Amino acid sequence: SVDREEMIERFANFLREYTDEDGNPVYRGKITDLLTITPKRSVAIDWMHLNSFDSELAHEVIENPEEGISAAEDAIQIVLREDFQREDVGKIHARFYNLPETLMVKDIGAEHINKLIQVEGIVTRVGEIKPFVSVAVFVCKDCGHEMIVPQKPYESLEKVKKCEQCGSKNIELDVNKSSFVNFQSFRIQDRPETLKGGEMPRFIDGILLDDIVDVALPGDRVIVTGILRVVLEAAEATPIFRKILEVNHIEPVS
Amino acid sequence: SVDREEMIERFANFLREYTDEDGNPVYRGKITDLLTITPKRSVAIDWMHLNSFDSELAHEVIENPEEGISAAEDAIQIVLREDFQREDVGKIHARFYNLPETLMVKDIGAEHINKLIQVEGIVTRVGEIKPFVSVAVFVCKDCGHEMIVPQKPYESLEKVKKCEQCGSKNIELDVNKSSFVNFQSFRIQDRPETLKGGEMPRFIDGILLDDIVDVALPGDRVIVTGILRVVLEAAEATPIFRKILEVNHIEPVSK
Amino acid sequence: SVDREEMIERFANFLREYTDEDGNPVYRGKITDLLTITPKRSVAIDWMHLNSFDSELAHEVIENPEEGISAAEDAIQIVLREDFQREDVGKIHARFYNLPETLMVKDIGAEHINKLIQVEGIVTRVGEIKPFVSVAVFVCKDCGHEMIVPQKPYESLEKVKKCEQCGSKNIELDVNKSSFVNFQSFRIQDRPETLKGGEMPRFIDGILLDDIVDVALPGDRVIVTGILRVVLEAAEATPIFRKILEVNHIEPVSK
Amino acid sequence: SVDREEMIERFANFLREYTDEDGNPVYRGKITDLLTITPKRSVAIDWMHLNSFDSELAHEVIENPEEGISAAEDAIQIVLREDFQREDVGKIHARFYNLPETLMVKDIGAEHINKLIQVEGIVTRVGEIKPFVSVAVFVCKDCGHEMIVPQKPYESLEKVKKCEQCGSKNIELDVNKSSFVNFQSFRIQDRPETLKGGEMPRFIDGILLDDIVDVALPGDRVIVTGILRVVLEAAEATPIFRKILEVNHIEPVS
Amino acid sequence: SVDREEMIERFANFLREYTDEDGNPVYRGKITDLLTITPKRSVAIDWMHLNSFDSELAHEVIENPEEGISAAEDAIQIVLREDFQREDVGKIHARFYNLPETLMVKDIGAEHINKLIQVEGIVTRVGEIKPFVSVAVFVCKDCGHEMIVPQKPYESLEKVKKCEQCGSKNIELDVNKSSFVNFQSFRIQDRPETLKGGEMPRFIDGILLDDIVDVALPGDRVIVTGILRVVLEAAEATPIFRKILEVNHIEPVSK
Amino acid sequence: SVDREEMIERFANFLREYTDEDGNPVYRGKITDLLTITPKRSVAIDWMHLNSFDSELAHEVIENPEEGISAAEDAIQIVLREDFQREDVGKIHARFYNLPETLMVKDIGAEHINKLIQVEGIVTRVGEIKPFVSVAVFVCKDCGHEMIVPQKPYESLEKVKKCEQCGSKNIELDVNKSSFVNFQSFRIQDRPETLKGGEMPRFIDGILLDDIVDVALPGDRVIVTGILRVVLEAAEATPIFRKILEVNHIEPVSK
Ligand SMILES: [Zn+2]
Ligand SMILES: [Zn+2]
Ligand SMILES: [Zn+2]
Ligand SMILES: [Zn+2]
Ligand SMILES: [Zn+2]
Ligand SMILES: [Zn+2]
């Protein structure tokens, strides 16, 4: 695979040196869109672009999306500081799109977990937009010690039983220190027309976070990319699970 | 007894302060968990806890479950607002369990009317799930005045005779404005294995609302807490009554 | 949302202009066909079409099916008059199908009240076909004043108390003046093959009017779209409700 | 994380330099047991040993067992050649044991996929010992071109539709070129005595391969280590899965 | 017709050589898959394939399904042995499907006795699953001689009168030595939707063995192939017969 | 495997020597207790104990329960005689429980024939208690010769054709000489709560003898161990079999 601190620097180069098939730089100018009056919090990275410039890195994102994204997101944090003297901007998302292979929803499940994939389908329903605790800061009300606990949006709220410093159980969730974002679930499946006659269509549930919330309605034809997650479904004599797609990038199909 | 305002205070306290013998802030943690992405709509409260922390209040929810349960629900809403800055959060139920006495169905008398009881028995039947109007919003077709009327699932629907404001006798219940929850009847009785030979087992009908509907099938042995109600027999106009159990909490025995 | 006058415009547009990916003017062609010697009394509209052409309007018929369906039917009548010089043509239904979400019977909650839903399931029962008064014409025996009163098949008959004009309390429903259509109840439920072991299948009653009556027998598996209604349980005066599905479109699954 | 070619060399050092808390080398002599009249095909590596000598590597095995093992197995292949002039020995397994944390069976499922874990429980049943195609060699009967396809024991036999060289569909599985091993499933759960009164015990199914087949009978109390795998269970409207434990090392509890 | 030895040759060929219009070696691939860790115990053979590759043989399995089916099973066993060096592999069934003609239950006559037919209909009933002795091993209590006797699930058990070797009339069936498979009866009939008004639907009983037992529930519409049997009515000693369908292959219609 | 003489030795050992993790001589203590004024007629043996002490023997009682159970019962009789000088003591059963695998009723196949299995399920039915002849003493009316014939409760009564000694064909079963024990049938099945939706629960009939008769009523959930038997369906002369569970040990789940 590839060293983590190295991907960071390898992405910075992509972000800078790249220019498309007409000889025009592009990611320099996407980064500037982060500093308008109404900024964005996301940088859409074409993967065909990243592969034609750095094939060995592009195949590492897919193989390890969790690290691959986290890396590219540090490389954006840097380039904003080195090429634009900014360290005030805060969290920026790196959303990859236009991957090599496009799955139909039915083809997922056969697919492997924790790997970046691309799916095309139709949205059948979307949830209530609700606040998600993405970072929980617990506080000992006895000694004062703070404890940070990061959260996965596909697992319930994880907490801490006792204070790691003084051993006290008298802890509370500090809502102010903690970090919240928007959350919105949705469900896609394969469009009836792309299936055979007596073929039951299949579905998968997704998670949208922060700034890609409220991006879609039912009936929308879409192309999402994200990471599959295995989630508990029922704790039977032996547990069964399902697969949900934590979305990294979504756009409508044209 | 205790007035509402004060019960709510006493409850909000219990929730925040109570700790078990190990020092876990049980009810703080449960309320904390309502901030999870897919929360419960109930908070179960061990009566023995409430009793050890505020015995007068604990004995008060048995005597006046309707008040106590309501107070405890308002307390929860307060803690969510005050200690977690959560507002939009919906109704959260306070369900009490583990009362000091467990009755057999044959022991449930009309003296227990409108108090909280705890019964053990086996489910004989379970009704079909239907919607029930917890909150009926009526609307005048003339002035468009909106009158809110709460209902009880064991009493008949309470309509309005005439508009309270414009005086019009032309009001209907507005379905879109009103609030509904799931409803499901069920029946428990004493198992024959617990009775004298020859003894006819006694039963009682209950009601399950909202998030405890469809929690039991026939053949299940359960422990329920609930407010006993005695309602006039609809069957006739005679002075014979019918015991109904409005369930507050239900769990299966041995789990 | 959209006011009636404007929906009708937006609909008439859709009908005339919409074309599929191949360029066929689907709804023009269907309306054209109403000029055949033995026409249909309905025009089925693929929701996904309406959505791709006028998404705001499409999401509007789900939110307010009663309005949307009514608007679309007025639009059809317009196109027949304007583009085909056809007047006498009777009522033509607008039946929407292929909604984005398909519910199981067990998922149909009272939150869906008065919205359009799409359900899949198996027909358990089918009622006897009877006449229903879509339009009740009442007539005063004194002045001969005629009062028109529309009805809903899931509500009780709305009569008139007294003559609106001469004030007489002597009016009867005139059968010859009134309009009737076929009516037929039916029931669908989830197939056990789709539930957890031990799970009791849930069901729901529906209503078929006019030209979709007698379209299904028991055993059929179907997909219906319809406006969910929640009506007070006639069984009693209690606050318990009953879900009824007023079917807008029905087709068998897989065909 | 760590570079792959590097773990190899890092393991070779462990295998050589290590000596226990009494000052005696150990893995030098385990490797010689591979060259007796009746050799072994496995080297049991204590993890407490690997952690006390190379903490950063030991935590990488657990985090990436698939690579971590494959690495340590190359490092054994080497050390047999460099310190014992042998490249004839063939496939040797690296089986890690005595990990930091021991799960009860019930605690699995909550556990993460593709990570080395350790479980204690009791065997309730064991399967028929049967031959598993671990490496499938397909052959084009037209041009002659060979195609190698490696197999996962928790997924059905994977094949190839057509010849990658000449495009022909006239392919056959060459049983002689292909590689087979023993396979035997089994099932463990938590011992009734370590559970509460009205507590339904939970189970998990395991896979034993090659030389660790037939190692256990029902009733045996055991400590296995392995990698969890998510497997399809039923292709419902949305697919459900289960978790099975591909075993890396098994021994009875004393 | 064809003798057994030669059918097996012709079948082994078909399996190995057959390719579809795209060039896929269908039956090679299916047999290849029996080497997977959890294999099937059947190989389904499209009759239309066999027909296009060896028409005389194909028409032979309809005329003599018992022979053909047996030959095809021996062929499979050969290919596994010869081309995959697999021996221990158990019995593998050859199940034929997609025959040229599909009968309605009302068309199945006794002329079809002992031939292969293909029927479409709806499952009315499904029996309880029971064990059936495919291979009865008898054992003499005196000499310990072992006599193997195959059985048919539609005929009565064929015992042995006396030991074939030591002549002893003291033999019993040995259960441990014998082979059993699952058995399950079922019944199909024509759907009334396919008959004249007033017509009484006709039915027929079938048998499912081994790995096709418990494949259908009532209400399922299916297409089955099977050997028709006509057995004397056990009901009496009269000369009236009963049609039974010994199913070779079953799949649901429309899938 | 192990011959009878040697199993008995190995068993007698286990009984005497076995100790748990705390050092209690469990089976010594149980056998000691048979000297109490009102003893049991059974000694329950935890399989996991026998397995930890003599694994080969333990796996042997599963493979050959009839032998193993019989051997263990002879061992008990020995220990009572040798270590307690007790002779007159009647038959004492050896009932094994807590086997390594627990089957669902649907998993019990004829491969388990004549082995020991452990099943979990719910009692659907319980038969009437009747007497069964464990030991049939037949008596010749001419010479007065006595022939002992043991019986199995799942097979038909084995009589004697003619007197073994005087050759007379005139023998009857002597009731006073014979031994009887209580007999009771029962039936268990899988609970629907444990099956796929739509799945028909499977069941199995069992037999309780002597001191475990009348131990369960319908509705009880139980864990049984027993020797599976497959007996020919008496219903007919067909080759279809019937699974019957000859219960060795039964206890209710969770207690
Ligand atoms: Zn602290
Ligand atoms: Zn008013
Ligand atoms: Zn008038
Ligand atoms: Zn080739
Ligand atoms: Zn003989
Ligand atoms: Zn005699």
Author numbering:
A (entry chain H), D (entry chain H): 0 to 253
B (entry chain D), C (entry chain C), E (entry chain D), F (entry chain C): 0 to 254
Question: What does the article say, verbatim?
Answer:
The Minichromosome Maintenance (MCM) complex forms an essential hexameric-ring helicase that unwinds DNA at the replication fork (1–3). MCM proteins have three conserved domains: an N-terminal domain (MCMN) that mediates the head-to-head interaction of the initial double-hexamer; a conserved AAA+ ATPase domain; and a short helix-turn-helix domain at the C-terminus. Crystal structures of the N-terminal domains of Methanobacterium thermautotrophicus (MtMCMN), Sulfolobus solfataricus (SsoMCMN) and Pyrococcus furiosis (PfMCMN) show a consistent hexameric ring structure with three subdomains: a helical subdomain-A, a Zn-binding subdomain-B and an OB-fold subdomain-C. The crystal structure of PfMCMN bound to single-stranded DNA (ssDNA) revealed that subdomain-C binds ssDNA in the plane of the hexameric ring via conserved residues defined as the MCM single-stranded DNA-binding motif (MSSB).
One mutant is a triple-mutant of the PfMCMN β-turn, K233A/R234A/K236A (PfMCMN-βT). The crystal structure of PfMCMN-βT consists of a central pentameric ring with five peripheral monomers. This shift is not compatible with retaining the specific P238-V132 interaction in a hexamer because the constituent atoms are separated by 4 Å when PfMCMN-βT monomers are superimposed on each subunit of the wild-type hexamer (data not shown). AUC sedimentation velocity and equilibrium experiments show that PfMCMN-βT most likely adopts a pentameric structure in solution. The PfMCMN-βT mutant forms a pentameric ring that does not bind ssDNA.
